[PDB]
Enzyme design. Structure first.
Site, PDB file in Angstrom:
ATOM      1  CG  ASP A  76      -1.840   1.234   1.417  1.00  0.00           C
ATOM      2  OD1 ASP A  76      -2.490   1.505   0.177  1.00  0.00           O
ATOM      3  OD2 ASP A  76      -1.608   2.045   2.320  1.00  0.00           O
TER       4      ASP A  76
ATOM      5  CG  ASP B  57      -1.079   5.210   2.898  1.00  0.00           C
ATOM      6  OD1 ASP B  57      -1.470   4.401   1.724  1.00  0.00           O
ATOM      7  OD2 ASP B  57      -1.312   4.678   4.172  1.00  0.00           O
TER       8      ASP B  57
ATOM      9  CD  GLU C 264      -0.930  10.850   4.442  1.00  0.00           C
ATOM     10  OE1 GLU C 264      -1.143  11.738   5.000  1.00  0.00           O
ATOM     11  OE2 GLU C 264      -1.354   9.496   4.563  1.00  0.00           O
TER      12      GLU C 264
ATOM     13  CE1 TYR D 132      -7.784   9.632   6.980  1.00  0.00           C
ATOM     14  CE2 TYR D 132      -9.511   7.912   6.933  1.00  0.00           C
ATOM     15  CZ  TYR D 132      -8.001   8.509   7.000  1.00  0.00           C
ATOM     16  OH  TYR D 132      -7.238   7.368   6.417  1.00  0.00           O
TER      17      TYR D 132
END
Length: 576
Positions: free
Chosen positions: A290, A292, A294, A370
């Site tokens: 995965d 991620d 950012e 979120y």
């Protein structure tokens, strides 16, 4: 005659042989600490002190011959290689032309990183997590954090595995530029410098080897000399218990994304993709990878990073090349490997990646629905809402409006639906999108009743700063609180409010709050109702399912409600 081999049990960690060498009682560079071998080297000493020696030995595992060799004289060392991990009943036999004689049997352990030598993990799960019959097609995801085992005291065996299809393990760092890691204080940047000593930049490493594989967990039967320990030994045993569980390492995250911005140079992707293939060959309980990052285009922890021209094509290429590599592992191993990514859903994050392209290599996108609002400034809003709240200005929701100073909104407001629609509208398939659930609140203080422009809605107030509290309250960082902490300190068992907090819900947004009018403390989070609304929304759109950050902060309520809201639903699994 020959006399029966008598096996010397001493000096081999009780006949435990491991395919993986892991440095213990030290912390050092990743390539110094971890060494994997396709075949375990098995060495067994036996003697034959009375009578005839014989010519040749045979080793049996569970009655099947696995090795052979020459008897040396009255003491020989059986020496051979073995690929398949497990527990075996071993006998050693000595033969000559007159006959054969064998030792008494003895248990041998060959340790591998699929947990093939491990019994199913004994669980200790909060009984507030309920059982459900959610269809197995639906994703039910969460993150388990490596550092959750310290002050948060939440360990692999506390996870409600039967209620999970995917465990994302946060986080695997990338060696290289990592100044964002400094934001966390403590020894986290220094630990990464150590782990990276002797490792090429852009290769993955284990951030905390203590947590990952050195710490002895007595609830898992670990002994100090056990060859694999920590969270990793436990996740290995967990997959022995739930073989259909997908466990996936999560690379990057908020503080570990700096190296991603150098993936514009293919040479760096090549180095990264190769280290990931090796990481997955070394750590076999993992079922894919995965990413991620950012964020492509910036807006993450590193203010001096982000390129909205080049990062998107770099991310796409990264996905393309990771998928070629996992197809190799699939050919080599016969298994299925997933490729996933958690992504921002603000319009200004989505626009920097052509997801219509990227998604063809991917099994799932974990939509980070979120962190829409929070304590980084003094503007209240719904951090994890499905829809536009009542607080928002006319035209704020779709972005055509103007703010309080007459200045245009630059894009649609931060809500889960604005983000999902932008994704779908590009051609990203619904059955590859997983909707994010928060197991935590973000919060302010100073939001007293006189700051409110609509007295019925504290989302129209103004804060003076971040929510403050103690770790015992679930405040691990100012302005963020564990859901279980909100339940204990703000909601109470009946969800009607305690300690001077009132509960409120914005029916339009699908978003709860708790507000203490007298301190001005205001918290935005997900509760049972808002999570049921997210499951309903996922059912209506045919999304892959739900995922959550982070399970240590749940008390069962959030994961339960994730399950309840998908009751009856089925989805089509994807293809890559």
């Amino acid at each position: 005659a020959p006399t029966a081999p008598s096996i010397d049990m001493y000096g081999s960690n009780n006949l435990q042989f491991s395919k993986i060498e892991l440095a213990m009682e030290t912390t050092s560079g990743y390539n110094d600490m971890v060494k994997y071998h396709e075949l375990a080297k098995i060495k067994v000493k036996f003697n034959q002190w009375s009578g005839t020696s014989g010519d040749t030995y045979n080793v049996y595992f569970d009655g099947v011959k696995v090795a052979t060799g020459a008897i040396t004289g009255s003491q020989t060392t059986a020496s051979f290689e073995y690929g398949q991990g497990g527990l075996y009943q071993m006998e050693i036999e000595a033969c000559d032309a007159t006959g054969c004689s064998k030792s008494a049997p003895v248990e041998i352990t060959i340790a591998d990183t699929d947990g093939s030598h491990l019994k199913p993990l004994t669980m200790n799960v909060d009984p507030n997590n309920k059982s459900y019959n959610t269809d197995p097609s639906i994703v039910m995801g969460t993150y388990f954090v490596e550092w959750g085992i310290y002050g948060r005291d939440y360990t692999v065996d506390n996870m409600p595995v039967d209620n999970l299809t995917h465990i994302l393990y946060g986080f695997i760092p990338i060696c290289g530029p990592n100044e964002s890691v400094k934001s966390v204080g403590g020894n986290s940047f220094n630990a990464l410098q150590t782990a990276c000593r002797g490792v090429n930049d852009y290769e993955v490493v284990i951030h905390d080897p203590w947590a990952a594989y050195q710490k002895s967990f007595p609830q898992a039967g670990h002994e100090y000399s056990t060859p694999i320990k920590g969270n990793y030994a436990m996740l290995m045993a967990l997959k022995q218990r739930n073989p259909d569980l997908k466990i996936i390492p999560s690379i990057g995250g908020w503080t570990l994304s700096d190296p991603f911005y150098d993936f514009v140079d293919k040479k760096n992707r090549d180095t990264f993709v190769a280290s990931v293939k090796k990481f997955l060959k070394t750590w076999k309980f993992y079922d894919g990878v995965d990413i991620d990052w950012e964020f492509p285009g910036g807006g993450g922890a590193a203010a001096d990073k982000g390129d909205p021209v080049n990062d998107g094509p770099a991310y796409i290429a990264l996905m393309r090349e990771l998928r070629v590599m996992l197809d190799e592992l699939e050919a080599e191993t016969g298994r299925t490997y997933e490729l996933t990514s958690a992504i921002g859903v603000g319009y200004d994050k989505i626009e920097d990646v052509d997801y219509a392209d990227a998604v063809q290599y991917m099994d799932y996108i974990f939509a980070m629905t979120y962190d829409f609002y929070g304590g980084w400034n003094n503007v209240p809003g719904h951090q994890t809402a499905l829809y536009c709240g009542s607080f928002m200005r006319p035209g704020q929701c779709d972005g055509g409006g103007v703010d309080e100073n007459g200045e245009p909104y630059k894009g649609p407001a931060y809500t889960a639906d604005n983000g999902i629609q932008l994704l779908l509208a590009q051609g990203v398939p619904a059955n590859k999108l997983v909707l994010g659930t928060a197991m935590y609140g973000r919060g302010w203080e100073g939001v007293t009743p006189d700051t409110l422009t609509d007295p019925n809605d504290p989302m129209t107030g103004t804060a003076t700063g971040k929510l403050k509290g103690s770790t015992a309250q679930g405040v691990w960082e100012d302005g963020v609180i564990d859901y279980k902490g909100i339940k204990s300190f703000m909601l109470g068992a009946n969800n009607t409010g305690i300690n001077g907090f009132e509960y409120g819900y914005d029916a339009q947004a699908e978003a709860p709050w708790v507000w203490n009018r007298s301190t001005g403390e205001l918290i935005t989070f997900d509760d049972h109702r808002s999570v049921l609304a997210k499951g309903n929304y996922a059912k209506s759109l045919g999304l892959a399912g739900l995922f959550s950050w982070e399970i240590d902060a749940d008390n069962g309520d959030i994961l339960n409600a994730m399950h309840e809201g998908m009751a009856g639903g089925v989805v089509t699994p994807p293809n890559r």
